[PDB]
């Protein structure tokens, strides 16, 4: 359990985005965030590589498929300043 | 004394080139030339003076009009060099270009006018003044090499009293390079 793992675990219940390795990016509200970067979110808009965008009431992205995790600026300063 | 002068000229041509341009392996076409070449190249022991079982037809360059006229009109001795492959290094490899040059030299040594007419498939094609070989395409050069190989095989069959359908690709490569089957 590292400090980015603790930042992703504390980002549950807030607006966050997950950019996958295939090119699709799903931005929504996370619900479950494990230590292995498994992100289960609800009511997220997902945009594929073709340019189309859809909405989903529930989604679950794994840790290996999720390439990047865009976090909000609320937890970007505290308590992540002493690290 | 003539063999010693030729070995001294070869050693002077080797010493005139820098160390990055000096070769490390020498192939002597004549068997009576490697013996003074070991004596004349005693200052450079890193070169290998090896013999040659396949004699390259170097008289085809003197049988050509341009190089023959440049050799005949030169009243003073010089070291003017040239390029055997004009633009064959950017299109093909070094082994295939040398094989095509050896096949063309064997075809010119077998016949002057026949190989001169088979080298140009059309009457509109011409060679550059900076080049020696006529500029052709890949399929045209392949057809010219096939015609030269067929003429060399016909000359080998008419000269050695053998048939035409009894030599493979290795035998044709040995006959084009000068080796004996």
């Amino acid at each position: 359990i590292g400090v980015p793992i603790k930042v992703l675990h504390e980002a549950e219940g807030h607006i966050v985005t997950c950019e996958t390795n295939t090119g699709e990016v799903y931005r929504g509200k996370l619900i479950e965030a494990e230590d292995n970067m498994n992100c289960q979110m609800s009511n997220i808009t997902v945009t594929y590589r073709d340019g189309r965008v859809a909405q989903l009431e529930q989604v679950y992205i794994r840790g290996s498929k999720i390439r990047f995790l865009i976090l909000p600026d609320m937890l970007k300063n505290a308590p992540m300043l002493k690290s | 004394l003539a063999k010693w002068k030729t070995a001294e000229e070869v050693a002077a041509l080797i010493r005139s080139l820098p160390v990055e341009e000096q070769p490390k392996q020498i192939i002597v076409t004549r068997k009576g030339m490697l013996d003074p070449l070991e004596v004349h190249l005693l200052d450079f022991p890193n070169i290998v003076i090896k013999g040659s079982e396949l004699q390259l037809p170097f008289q085809a360059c003197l049988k050509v009009e341009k190089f023959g006229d440049l050799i005949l009109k030169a009243t003073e001795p010089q070291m003017v060099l040239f390029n055997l492959y004009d633009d064959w290094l950017k299109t093909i490899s070094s082994y295939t270009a040398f094989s095509r040059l050896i096949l063309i030299l064997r075809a010119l040594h077998v016949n002057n006018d026949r190989a001169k007419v088979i080298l140009k498939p059309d009457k509109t094609t011409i060679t550059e003044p900076h080049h020696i070989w006529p500029t052709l395409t890949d399929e045209e050069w392949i057809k010219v090499e096939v015609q030269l190989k067929d003429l060399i095989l016909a000359d080998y069959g008419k000269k050695n009293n053998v048939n035409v359908a009894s030599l493979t690709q290795s035998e044709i490569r040995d006959i084009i390079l000068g080796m004996e089957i």
Binding site: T22, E24, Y26, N38, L56, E57, Y60, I61, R62, K65 | -
Partner: protein, 74 residues
């Protein structure tokens, strides 16, 4: 220390999984695995050609598990 993922809300629900070779599938998850393997009952193909081919009981490995969208209410 291989912790299983939170797949209790997606159990016995018709969801669509994505395979990492640009593929998709749809079916009802009947359990979970610590290696993120999913057992899907009545799994239809739903490939990129446009035709869906039902198979039944199938298993998908966790290495190719890209995403999972719960089509049913969870």
């Amino acid at each position: 220390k291989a912790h299983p993922p939170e797949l209790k809300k997606f159990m016995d629900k018709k969801l669509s999984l994505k395979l990492n070779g640009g593929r998709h599938v749809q079916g009802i998850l009947r359990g979970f695995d610590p290696f993120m393997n999913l057992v899907i009952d009545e799994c239809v193909e739903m490939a990129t050609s446009g035709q869906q081919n039902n198979i039944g009981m199938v298993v998908i490995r966790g290495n190719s598990i890209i995403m999972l969208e719960a089509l049913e209410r969870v």
